[PDB]
């Protein structure tokens, strides 16, 4: 069994000043060019990878997991999932949810009701990518009245309202709802030992906790990749259907270029692709209808957008398979986010160290990726720590509390791991604002009004690093 990484002791002695231990300079993340080989027109409308469940045993069939995570399958629709497991979708009906927590916060998007799969400017003159979607907030009781009365009224654009990213995170408030979801097979569960997001150690709302959507026809979630390219799981509660549009991860660079060309931000913007543009650019689009009880698995980095066709609720969360592919794509997006000044809500450094504490990794490729991250960050931490002491800057032991969240720079929003540069919040001597090293130094060249907090004992990190070794299969 061959080790390709230096020991923690060797890393530390390297930082204390001769030869280098690693390059440290790295090709900058960038958006991929159009995939090669190009697809001909007859391959731009592929069928959606599908699983047809009938019995409870079908859902727990092991190859199902591998089918969904297969990188060649950008999305998988699992038909008849609720019925196979005898899930009580009624626990997520609008009626049941309102009775449970009448006053619950619901974030809203107000949108124009667009025809079919198209998106037109407000005057209905031309198709555009910009998707008008304005934010407000209401209660579940009030959105429920709107949805229910809508479903009655039905039976140059109209405005509609969409209850979105409703947080079902509180186990006290949603006990029965959340218990029902423990009936799911491990690979799609909100919490499981094999889900990287269960190793974060703290809540990331909507990723490792459940989010609810309450929809009327036309309610759209515009184009995106998931946060840090994590897989997504979505179950349609019904009674109506949702329509999904999916583009493989490998085309995200092409979509990025479309956004830019239409003066829109790929990562943060609100955009609804013009399918005719995609077709001309030879981008394949998977398109399908999700019925009530059907589960949609969005694979890692898959680009997608969604609209309600009927009146329905959906529930959804992220999961992170323990695979080289998932870890690679999450790290890539983390690095690209840094370059774009976009916050990664999955703190990939914090997470990687927890993975190293908790998980015995037997796949060599995945093992090497994780340990490489540990090496780079351990070196960065020891190097910074040595610089600070060389400057006589004091390092105050701060430690961590159980379940404490990862901290981020209040200025650039980068994750700040281990060594926190903190200065008082304005008009406060109590509350401190976390900064990364660079941002702290641009406010104060010599860190005058800053304190440096240390969250982990270096001896601890060194031990985790050395104890992280390739597991036998």
């Amino acid at each position: 069994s061959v080790s390709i990484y230096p020991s923690s002791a060797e890393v530390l002695k390297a930082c204390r000043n001769n030869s280098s231990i690693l390059l440290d300079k790295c090709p900058p993340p960038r958006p991929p060019s159009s995939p090669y080989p190009p697809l001909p027109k007859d391959k731009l409308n592929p069928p959606t990878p599908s699983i047809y469940l009938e019995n409870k045993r079908d859902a727990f069939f092991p190859p199902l997991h591998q089918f969904c995570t297969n990188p060649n399958n950008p999305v998988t629709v699992i038909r008849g999932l609720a019925g196979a497991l005898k899930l009580d979708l009624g626990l997520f009906s609008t009626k049941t949810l309102v009775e449970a927590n009448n006053e619950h916060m619901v974030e809203v998007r107000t949108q124009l009701l667009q025809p079919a799969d198209e998106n037109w400017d407000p005057t209905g003159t031309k198709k555009i990518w910009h998707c008008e979607s304005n934010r407000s907030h209401t209660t579940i009781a009030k959105y429920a009245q709107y949805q229910a009365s809508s479903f009655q009224e039905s039976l140059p654009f109209k405005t509609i309202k969409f209850g979105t990213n409703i947080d079902l995170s509180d186990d006290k408030k949603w006990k029965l709802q959340l218990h029902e979801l423990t009936k799911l097979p491990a690979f799609v569960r909100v919490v499981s030992a094999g889900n990287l997001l269960s190793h974060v150690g703290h809540t990331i709302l909507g990723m490792n906790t459940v989010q609810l959507y309450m929809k009327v026809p036309g309610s759209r979630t515009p184009g995106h990749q998931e946060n840090n390219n994590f897989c997504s799981v979505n179950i349609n509660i019904g009674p109506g259907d949702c329509e999904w549009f999916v583009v493989p991860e490998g085309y995200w660079g092409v979509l990025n270029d479309f956004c830019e060309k239409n003066n829109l931000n790929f990562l943060m913007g609100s955009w609804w692709p013009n399918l005719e543009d995609l077709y001309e650019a030879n981008v394949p689009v998977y398109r399908f209808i999700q019925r009530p009880g059907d589960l949609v698995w969005i694979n890692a980095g898959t680009v997608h957008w969604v609209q309600a066709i009927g009146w329905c609720n959906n529930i959804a969360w992220n999961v992170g398979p323990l695979t080289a592919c998932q870890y690679k794509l999450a790290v890539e997006r983390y690095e690209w986010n840094k370059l774009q000044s976009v916050k990664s809500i999955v703190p990939m450094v914090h997470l990687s160290w927890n993975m190293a504490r908790n998980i015995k990794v037997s796949d060599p490729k995945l093992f090497e990726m994780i340990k490489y991250c540990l090496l780079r960050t351990l070196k960065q931490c020891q190097t910074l720590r040595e610089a600070l002491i060389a400057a006589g800057k004091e390092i105050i032991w701060h430690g961590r509390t159980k379940e404490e969240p990862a901290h981020y720079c209040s200025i650039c929003e980068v994750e700040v791991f281990d060594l926190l540069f903190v200065t008082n919040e304005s008009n406060s001597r109590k509350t401190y604002i976390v900064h990364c090293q660079d941002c702290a130094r641009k406010t104060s060249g010599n860190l005058e009004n800053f304190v440096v907090l240390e969250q982990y004992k270096m001896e601890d990190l060194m031990q985790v690093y050395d104890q992280f070794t390739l597991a036998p299969p």
């Binding site: 974030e107 998007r109 910009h130 998707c131 008008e132 979607s133 304005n134 934010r135 979105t164 990213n165 947080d167 703290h202 809540t203 990331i204 709302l205 909507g206 990723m207 989010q211 979630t221 515009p222 995106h224 946060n227 943060m268 913007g269 609100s270 955009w271 992220n318 809500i345 999955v346 703190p347 105050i396 701060h398 430690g399 969240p405 990862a406 901290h407 209040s410 926190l420 903190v422 919040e425 109590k430 509350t431 401190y432 604002i433 976390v434 304190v451 907090l453």
Partner: peptide, 17 residues
């Protein structure tokens, strides 16, 4: 022990206004 300002990490949809 110093109290650090924080914001809850959360998945959310784009908004244009």
């Amino acid at each position: 022990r110093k109290q650090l300002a924080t914001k809850a990490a959360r998945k959310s949809a784009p908004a244009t206004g």
